[PDB]
Amino acid sequence: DYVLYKDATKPVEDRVADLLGRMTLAEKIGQMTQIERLVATPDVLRDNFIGSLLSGGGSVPRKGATAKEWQDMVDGFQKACMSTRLGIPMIYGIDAVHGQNNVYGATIFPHNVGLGATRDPYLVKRIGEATALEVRATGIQYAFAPCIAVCRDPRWGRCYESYSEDRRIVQSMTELIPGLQGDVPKDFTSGMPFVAGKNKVAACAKHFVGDGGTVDGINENNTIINREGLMNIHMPAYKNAMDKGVSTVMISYSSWNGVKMHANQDLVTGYLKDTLKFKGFVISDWEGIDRITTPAGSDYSYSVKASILAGLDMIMVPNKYQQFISILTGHVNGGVIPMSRIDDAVTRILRVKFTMGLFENPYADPAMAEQLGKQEHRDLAREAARKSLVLLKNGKTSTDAPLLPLPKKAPKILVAGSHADNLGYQCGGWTIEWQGDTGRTTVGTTILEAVKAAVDPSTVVVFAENPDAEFVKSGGFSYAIVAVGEHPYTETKGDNLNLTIPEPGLSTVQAVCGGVRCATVLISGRPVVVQPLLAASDALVAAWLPGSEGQGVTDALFGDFGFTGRLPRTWFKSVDQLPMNVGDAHYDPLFRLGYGLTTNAT
Ligand SMILES: *[C@@H]1O[C@H](CO)[C@@H](O[C@@H]2O[C@H](CO)[C@@H](O[C@@H]3O[C@H](CO[C@H]4O[C@H](CO)[C@@H](O)[C@H](O)[C@@H]4O[C@@H]4O[C@H](CO)[C@@H](O)[C@H](O)[C@H]4NC(C)=O)[C@@H](O)[C@H](O)[C@@H]3O)[C@H](O)[C@H]2NC(C)=O)[C@H](O[C@@H]2O[C@@H](C)[C@@H](O)[C@@H](O)[C@@H]2O)[C@H]1NC(C)=O
Ligand SMILES: *[C@@H]1O[C@H](CO)[C@@H](O[C@@H]2O[C@H](CO)[C@@H](O[C@@H]3O[C@H](CO)[C@@H](O)[C@H](O)[C@@H]3O)[C@H](O)[C@H]2NC(C)=O)[C@H](O)[C@H]1NC(C)=O
Ligand SMILES: *[C@@H]1O[C@H](CO)[C@@H](O[C@@H]2O[C@H](CO)[C@@H](O)[C@H](O)[C@H]2NC(C)=O)[C@H](O)[C@H]1NC(C)=O
């Protein structure tokens, strides 16, 4: 007879209920399973009724693969899923944290900390829109963004993924969600999931909760703070996410007062689900449940029980699905985990899938392939890059002539530094590779390239990665642009207790600036010991991790636009002051939050 759940003209809730009521335990648990593409097969996906696949950092079908290659890969996995008895389409997830960053040729936008410096939520919203198009351009329908952590200690390797240390700024930036998913209807209830259609993607608010408040900025560690602070600082943005209809929420590896988030039923079910009324699905982090126990995985059975009972709906296994599905099946077959729990998880997962139209459009649209790296997106990124720059110094003394804007016409100029012509360094972590990379890893424009594309044709441009003092003094230069900073990093490989950029960097700035007036471009995902760099430079700009569009940097250096960016974090005098945020009693910053010199277009 008639099959309600397959009827597109029927309400989401009715369809969910109809489909759920037909599912077997194996099919229900399968929906709760998310596996890495590396361990997926048509048989595996079909036989285990897999509900979702993801692509971890760097997990690509081929280096430099095209948009169609991605679409083909996703579709291949989908055909397998659509062939099951119920034909429930899978949702493919990926880390498009600043563009479809794993994908080659994809537009790379400035990382969040830089976006916070723009104080322009609408811009961030437009980036979310561009990002959705580029993610769908590769056939993917789910982005693990935005990260709305409120980084409170720069020593955190993931601080660049935090818009600001001030939650009011992080809140304003949740506009990325409607950009990615689309604007929610005027009626809309806070907490319901939403996705406009096949041209949008389901978003993810992560990492619930307090991931940006770990002691000493140690990643995945403990966040020691009263419930007032937890709710005053780390919780606010999630409510905005609820109001804007975020589709999913990922749990944090971090603990809150000794308790693992992946096991905290009070917050996940009690607060997020019951209090906040979140109706989308809650997903774990990469082996997040394994880490509930220490050693990690030392009691996977306990890990599955604790996390599921806590309230999580989908688990990012993401490799040993056999064990996950086996163990969870036993716990259910044994009464250790009630069917209501399983039925709730599946309800939430199916609600999200029906709502976003996955049952109507399970396959990729070949016509979206051109969206990947569309010039307009690059122009947008370029704009974001420029607007995220923060001018810290612009003249050695109160009476010096302002160095920036620099003249586009000069006899001979010098571009130098380890970050002057290194697209990978410029993009930072979460780009092509998980930990990011060095060199020309994708399609873009380096600072050196941008400079050459901006100057007058009569202007001779010379490049030196690390020239010595003499080379500069006898070079007959009019001025120099030196770029230096941190190297790409992600998560733990990024935690740093000394926060001083690697060498050569300072030496290059001192050697260059000693020979000719200079403008130092500091590439970093956070504030770093900067007094020595300021000492040597005539002008210095904090460019954060601008992304693939280097011209955004020169658009400001050469006066096409005036600097407008303002520090989205506190800039410390020394690491021993940390933690140290705006509003603290001992607040003695080198540059207070909100600081930013300005200039006007020529
Ligand atoms: C302040 O704390 C930080 C973090 O604790 C510390 O940096 C870390 O230092 C570790 C060792 O001291 C280092 O581990 C070794 O890494 C080697 C490879 O490292 C290169 O490649 C990775 C990416 O694969 C980059 O992240 C690294 O920055 C490094 O990159 C190369 O760096 C050189 C020097 O500038 C440059 O000429 C190359 O072009 C560049 N190439 C690349 C790939 O970009 C391994 O082979 C080895 O087995 C260890 O695992 C960490 O990687 C590093 N963390 C990061 C992200 O930088 C920092 O230490 C200072 O800086 C490092 C780079 C090194 O020069 C130290 O001697 C120096 O002291 C520390 N600073 C202070 C104040 O002590
Ligand atoms: C927060 O971070 C701290 C510091 O990284 C964590 O402490 C560390 O905990 C691990 C185990 O969880 C300790 O590992 C050692 O392992 C060997 C065997 O592998 C064992 O013989 C040692 O006795 C020890 O367990 C490590 O020593 C310890 N580091 C120190 C000195 O503090 C802490 O567990 C993290 N907590 C949270 C909330 O994540
Ligand atoms: C020169 O630059 C200043 C600094 O940005 C401009 O003033 C800002 O203008 C923005 C809007 O463009 C306002 O939101 C800010 O409040 C202003 N900042 C302050 C305190 O001045 C100024 O309009 C620019 N003038 C020209 C001719 O471009």
Tab-separated table of C-alpha atoms in Angstrom, residues 179-491:
chain	number	residue	atom	x	y	z
A	179	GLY	CA	24.308	31.684	5.500
A	180	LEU	CA	25.052	27.968	5.314
A	181	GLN	CA	21.535	26.686	5.964
A	182	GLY	CA	19.412	29.586	4.760
A	183	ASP	CA	17.140	31.940	6.692
A	184	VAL	CA	14.490	30.371	8.894
A	185	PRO	CA	10.785	31.207	8.287
A	186	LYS	CA	9.175	34.042	10.260
A	187	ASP	CA	7.200	31.569	12.375
A	188	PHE	CA	10.059	29.177	13.231
A	189	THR	CA	10.544	27.751	16.729
A	190	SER	CA	13.912	28.118	18.460
A	191	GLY	CA	15.540	24.708	18.507
A	192	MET	CA	14.014	23.203	15.383
A	193	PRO	CA	16.434	22.154	12.613
A	194	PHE	CA	16.470	23.943	9.267
A	195	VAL	CA	18.007	23.832	5.796
A	196	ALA	CA	16.442	25.674	2.855
A	197	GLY	CA	17.175	23.143	0.151
A	198	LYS	CA	19.581	21.336	-2.133
A	199	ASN	CA	21.637	24.533	-2.446
A	200	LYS	CA	22.227	24.904	1.271
A	201	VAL	CA	23.888	22.647	3.797
A	202	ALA	CA	23.146	21.516	7.322
A	203	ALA	CA	25.405	23.344	9.781
A	204	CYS	CA	26.954	22.301	13.102
A	205	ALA	CA	27.415	24.320	16.307
A	206	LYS	CA	30.554	23.048	18.048
A	207	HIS	CA	31.927	22.077	20.470
A	208	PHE	CA	29.242	21.822	23.174
A	209	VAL	CA	30.335	23.184	25.590
A	210	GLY	CA	33.199	25.258	26.996
A	211	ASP	CA	35.851	23.961	24.604
A	212	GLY	CA	37.350	27.434	24.533
A	213	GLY	CA	37.796	27.542	28.295
A	214	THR	CA	40.285	24.785	29.125
A	215	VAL	CA	42.987	25.381	31.743
A	216	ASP	CA	46.169	26.816	30.175
A	217	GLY	CA	44.492	26.475	26.794
A	218	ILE	CA	45.326	22.786	26.771
A	219	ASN	CA	43.231	21.184	24.021
A	220	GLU	CA	40.598	18.587	24.950
A	221	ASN	CA	41.339	19.293	28.622
A	222	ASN	CA	39.295	20.492	31.617
A	223	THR	CA	37.260	23.702	31.896
A	224	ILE	CA	37.255	24.617	35.597
A	225	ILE	CA	34.595	27.273	36.163
A	226	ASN	CA	31.305	27.779	38.016
A	227	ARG	CA	27.993	27.222	36.210
A	228	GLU	CA	27.500	30.999	36.056
A	229	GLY	CA	30.635	31.449	33.971
A	230	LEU	CA	29.812	28.402	31.862
A	231	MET	CA	26.461	30.008	31.048
A	232	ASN	CA	27.722	33.584	30.932
A	233	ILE	CA	30.671	32.933	28.654
A	234	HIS	CA	30.599	29.568	26.887
A	235	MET	CA	26.864	28.905	26.550
A	236	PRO	CA	25.230	32.066	25.060
A	237	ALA	CA	26.072	31.494	21.366
A	238	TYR	CA	24.284	28.140	21.413
A	239	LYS	CA	20.983	29.870	22.162
A	240	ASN	CA	21.563	32.086	19.109
A	241	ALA	CA	22.286	28.896	17.173
A	242	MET	CA	18.968	27.479	18.384
A	243	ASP	CA	17.074	30.622	17.340
A	244	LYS	CA	18.689	30.509	13.920
A	245	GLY	CA	17.812	26.847	13.498
A	246	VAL	CA	21.191	25.119	13.551
A	247	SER	CA	20.725	21.520	12.379
A	248	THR	CA	23.259	19.747	14.576
A	249	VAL	CA	25.510	20.203	17.582
A	250	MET	CA	28.820	18.444	18.087
A	251	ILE	CA	30.013	17.554	21.587
A	252	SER	CA	33.417	18.667	22.886
A	253	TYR	CA	36.332	16.389	23.823
A	254	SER	CA	36.719	18.702	26.817
A	255	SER	CA	35.356	18.182	30.308
A	256	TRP	CA	33.520	20.613	32.584
A	257	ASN	CA	34.615	20.432	36.209
A	258	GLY	CA	36.006	16.930	35.826
A	259	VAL	CA	33.053	15.567	33.812
A	260	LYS	CA	33.474	14.476	30.165
A	261	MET	CA	31.047	16.308	27.858
A	262	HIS	CA	30.557	13.059	25.894
A	263	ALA	CA	29.082	11.628	29.108
A	264	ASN	CA	27.408	14.696	30.628
A	265	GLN	CA	23.687	13.912	30.531
A	266	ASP	CA	22.786	17.076	32.483
A	267	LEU	CA	24.066	19.446	29.800
A	268	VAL	CA	23.468	17.423	26.641
A	269	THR	CA	19.993	16.043	27.409
A	270	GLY	CA	18.889	18.180	30.334
A	271	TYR	CA	20.073	21.553	29.083
A	272	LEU	CA	20.630	21.397	25.325
A	273	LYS	CA	17.722	19.119	24.537
A	274	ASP	CA	15.164	19.758	27.277
A	275	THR	CA	15.854	23.326	28.423
A	276	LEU	CA	17.011	24.794	25.090
A	277	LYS	CA	14.617	22.521	23.174
A	278	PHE	CA	17.141	21.522	20.503
A	279	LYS	CA	15.399	19.184	18.049
A	280	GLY	CA	18.181	18.550	15.551
A	281	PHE	CA	20.675	15.799	16.252
A	282	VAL	CA	23.672	15.744	18.575
A	283	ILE	CA	26.852	14.261	17.125
A	284	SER	CA	30.093	13.234	18.834
A	285	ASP	CA	33.592	14.290	17.843
A	286	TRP	CA	36.269	12.087	16.261
A	287	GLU	CA	36.462	9.152	18.681
A	288	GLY	CA	34.991	11.427	21.328
A	289	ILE	CA	33.361	8.540	23.204
A	290	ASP	CA	36.631	6.531	23.152
A	291	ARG	CA	38.223	9.375	25.073
A	292	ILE	CA	35.570	9.291	27.789
A	293	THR	CA	37.758	6.645	29.432
A	294	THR	CA	41.490	6.872	30.102
A	295	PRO	CA	43.338	5.234	28.482
A	296	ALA	CA	41.072	6.062	25.533
A	297	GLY	CA	39.056	3.078	24.370
A	298	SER	CA	40.066	1.097	27.453
A	299	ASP	CA	36.351	0.342	27.912
A	300	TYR	CA	34.555	0.960	24.625
A	301	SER	CA	31.473	-0.773	26.016
A	302	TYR	CA	31.313	1.815	28.799
A	303	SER	CA	32.033	4.544	26.232
A	304	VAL	CA	29.015	3.576	24.104
A	305	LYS	CA	26.708	3.226	27.095
A	306	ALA	CA	27.767	6.493	28.735
A	307	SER	CA	27.615	8.609	25.576
A	308	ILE	CA	24.306	7.274	24.274
A	309	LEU	CA	22.593	7.423	27.672
A	310	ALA	CA	23.992	10.940	28.025
A	311	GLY	CA	21.957	11.970	25.001
A	312	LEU	CA	24.113	11.878	21.859
A	313	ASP	CA	22.231	10.800	18.712
A	314	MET	CA	24.958	10.129	16.125
A	315	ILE	CA	28.457	8.820	16.750
A	316	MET	CA	31.447	9.762	14.644
A	317	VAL	CA	33.064	6.363	15.183
A	318	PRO	CA	34.611	6.752	12.587
A	319	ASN	CA	36.481	3.550	11.723
A	320	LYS	CA	35.555	0.534	13.876
A	321	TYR	CA	31.835	0.584	13.132
A	322	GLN	CA	31.640	-3.175	13.609
A	323	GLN	CA	32.520	-2.788	17.299
A	324	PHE	CA	30.320	0.262	17.756
A	325	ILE	CA	27.278	-1.350	16.137
A	326	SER	CA	27.985	-4.657	17.848
A	327	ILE	CA	28.305	-3.210	21.352
A	328	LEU	CA	25.344	-0.832	21.066
A	329	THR	CA	23.184	-3.683	19.776
A	330	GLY	CA	24.047	-5.778	22.828
A	331	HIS	CA	23.329	-2.983	25.274
A	332	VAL	CA	19.901	-2.627	23.671
A	333	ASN	CA	19.240	-6.370	23.387
A	334	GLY	CA	20.067	-6.384	27.092
A	335	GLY	CA	17.872	-3.557	28.360
A	336	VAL	CA	20.914	-1.499	29.384
A	337	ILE	CA	19.812	1.199	26.900
A	338	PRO	CA	16.047	1.647	26.374
A	339	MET	CA	14.409	1.796	22.957
A	340	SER	CA	13.182	5.292	23.725
A	341	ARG	CA	16.800	6.497	23.692
A	342	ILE	CA	17.446	4.796	20.353
A	343	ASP	CA	14.091	5.942	19.004
A	344	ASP	CA	14.821	9.523	20.054
A	345	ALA	CA	18.233	9.579	18.394
A	346	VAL	CA	16.827	8.185	15.158
A	347	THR	CA	13.887	10.598	15.324
A	348	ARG	CA	16.258	13.571	15.480
A	349	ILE	CA	18.495	12.247	12.697
A	350	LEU	CA	15.569	11.554	10.350
A	351	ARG	CA	13.952	14.878	11.178
A	352	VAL	CA	17.098	16.657	10.008
A	353	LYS	CA	17.342	14.543	6.827
A	354	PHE	CA	13.714	15.031	5.811
A	355	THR	CA	13.803	18.729	6.675
A	356	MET	CA	16.811	19.407	4.454
A	357	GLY	CA	15.202	17.549	1.586
A	358	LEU	CA	17.704	14.669	1.498
A	359	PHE	CA	14.979	12.165	0.530
A	360	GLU	CA	14.079	14.293	-2.462
A	361	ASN	CA	17.646	15.146	-3.461
A	362	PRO	CA	20.029	12.394	-2.274
A	363	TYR	CA	22.438	12.851	-5.189
A	364	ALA	CA	24.798	15.620	-6.307
A	365	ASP	CA	23.819	18.239	-8.894
A	366	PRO	CA	26.449	18.228	-11.629
A	367	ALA	CA	25.506	21.843	-12.346
A	368	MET	CA	26.891	22.917	-8.961
A	369	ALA	CA	30.431	21.821	-9.799
A	370	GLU	CA	31.245	25.275	-11.212
A	371	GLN	CA	30.521	26.799	-7.796
A	372	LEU	CA	33.866	25.539	-6.488
A	373	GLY	CA	36.263	28.474	-6.485
A	374	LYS	CA	33.922	30.845	-8.286
A	375	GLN	CA	35.688	34.199	-8.699
A	376	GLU	CA	32.843	35.956	-6.927
A	377	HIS	CA	33.562	33.840	-3.851
A	378	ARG	CA	37.245	34.742	-4.120
A	379	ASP	CA	36.266	38.396	-4.372
A	380	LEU	CA	34.203	37.903	-1.217
A	381	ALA	CA	37.112	36.217	0.574
A	382	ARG	CA	39.404	38.967	-0.636
A	383	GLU	CA	37.048	41.489	0.974
A	384	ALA	CA	36.909	39.518	4.223
A	385	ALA	CA	40.700	39.204	4.255
A	386	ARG	CA	41.176	42.967	3.865
A	387	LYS	CA	38.534	43.788	6.483
A	388	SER	CA	40.073	41.397	8.995
A	389	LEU	CA	43.487	43.077	9.041
A	390	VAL	CA	44.338	45.015	12.179
A	391	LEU	CA	46.836	47.857	11.890
A	392	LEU	CA	48.829	47.925	15.130
A	393	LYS	CA	51.476	50.456	14.246
A	394	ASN	CA	51.836	52.936	11.413
A	395	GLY	CA	54.910	55.051	12.041
A	396	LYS	CA	57.783	54.667	14.506
A	397	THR	CA	57.119	58.009	16.248
A	398	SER	CA	54.286	60.511	16.714
A	399	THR	CA	55.869	62.781	14.113
A	400	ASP	CA	56.920	60.236	11.503
A	401	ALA	CA	55.113	60.297	8.178
A	402	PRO	CA	52.505	57.504	8.122
A	403	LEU	CA	54.050	54.624	6.170
A	404	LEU	CA	50.763	53.101	4.994
A	405	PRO	CA	49.233	53.476	2.472
A	406	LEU	CA	52.296	52.666	0.376
A	407	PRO	CA	52.674	54.263	-3.069
A	408	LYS	CA	51.830	51.902	-5.938
A	409	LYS	CA	54.503	53.593	-8.036
A	410	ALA	CA	58.098	53.363	-6.822
A	411	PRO	CA	61.435	52.777	-8.539
A	412	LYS	CA	62.294	49.501	-6.806
A	413	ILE	CA	60.643	47.692	-3.860
A	414	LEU	CA	61.375	44.663	-1.675
A	415	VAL	CA	58.995	41.848	-0.709
A	416	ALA	CA	60.478	39.479	1.886
A	417	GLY	CA	59.849	36.951	4.634
A	418	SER	CA	58.896	33.307	5.093
A	419	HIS	CA	55.221	34.193	4.656
A	420	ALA	CA	55.584	36.588	1.726
A	421	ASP	CA	55.222	33.865	-0.926
A	422	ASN	CA	53.832	30.788	0.843
A	423	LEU	CA	50.124	30.098	0.155
A	424	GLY	CA	50.032	27.260	2.663
A	425	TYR	CA	51.377	29.391	5.528
A	426	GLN	CA	48.905	32.109	4.549
A	427	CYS	CA	45.936	29.732	4.885
A	428	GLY	CA	46.915	27.993	8.110
A	429	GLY	CA	45.536	24.762	9.527
A	430	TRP	CA	42.486	23.039	8.067
A	431	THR	CA	43.564	23.600	4.467
A	432	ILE	CA	44.030	20.721	2.019
A	433	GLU	CA	45.707	18.732	4.807
A	434	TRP	CA	44.379	18.528	8.357
A	435	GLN	CA	47.393	20.268	9.916
A	436	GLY	CA	47.621	22.594	6.925
A	437	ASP	CA	50.748	22.678	4.811
A	438	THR	CA	53.652	24.658	3.425
A	439	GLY	CA	53.945	25.905	-0.143
A	440	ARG	CA	51.532	26.137	-3.053
A	441	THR	CA	48.965	23.568	-1.878
A	442	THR	CA	46.008	25.036	-3.771
A	443	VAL	CA	44.738	27.802	-6.082
A	444	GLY	CA	45.455	31.251	-4.653
A	445	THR	CA	47.471	34.463	-4.534
A	446	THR	CA	50.366	34.996	-2.140
A	447	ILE	CA	51.394	38.359	-0.739
A	448	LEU	CA	54.289	38.407	-3.249
A	449	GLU	CA	51.872	37.644	-6.076
A	450	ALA	CA	49.375	40.263	-4.858
A	451	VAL	CA	52.065	42.932	-4.641
A	452	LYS	CA	53.158	42.269	-8.229
A	453	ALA	CA	49.524	42.465	-9.312
A	454	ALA	CA	49.003	45.819	-7.640
A	455	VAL	CA	52.050	47.958	-8.326
A	456	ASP	CA	52.567	50.266	-11.280
A	457	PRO	CA	54.215	48.509	-14.251
A	458	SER	CA	57.226	50.803	-13.841
A	459	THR	CA	57.704	49.536	-10.283
A	460	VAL	CA	60.410	46.894	-10.054
A	461	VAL	CA	59.538	44.204	-7.520
A	462	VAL	CA	62.296	42.109	-5.945
A	463	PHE	CA	61.820	39.040	-3.773
A	464	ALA	CA	64.115	37.789	-1.007
A	465	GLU	CA	62.887	35.176	1.457
A	466	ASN	CA	65.501	36.004	4.071
A	467	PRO	CA	67.934	38.720	2.937
A	468	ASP	CA	70.671	40.034	5.220
A	469	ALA	CA	71.086	43.645	6.349
A	470	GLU	CA	73.586	44.487	3.625
A	471	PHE	CA	71.399	43.197	0.801
A	472	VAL	CA	68.707	45.631	1.870
A	473	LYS	CA	70.914	48.687	2.511
A	474	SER	CA	72.574	48.470	-0.911
A	475	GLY	CA	69.438	47.313	-2.687
A	476	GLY	CA	68.179	50.779	-3.487
A	477	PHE	CA	64.680	49.996	-2.249
A	478	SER	CA	61.983	52.577	-1.499
A	479	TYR	CA	60.245	50.407	1.091
A	480	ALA	CA	59.710	46.781	1.995
A	481	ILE	CA	56.881	44.409	2.844
A	482	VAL	CA	57.920	41.618	5.200
A	483	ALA	CA	55.599	38.761	6.070
A	484	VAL	CA	56.361	36.365	8.917
A	485	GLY	CA	54.502	34.342	11.523
A	486	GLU	CA	53.298	30.976	12.775
A	487	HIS	CA	53.277	27.817	10.708
A	488	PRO	CA	50.044	25.923	9.977
A	489	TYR	CA	48.651	23.901	12.884
A	490	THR	CA	45.454	22.321	14.141
A	491	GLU	CA	44.131	21.169	17.490
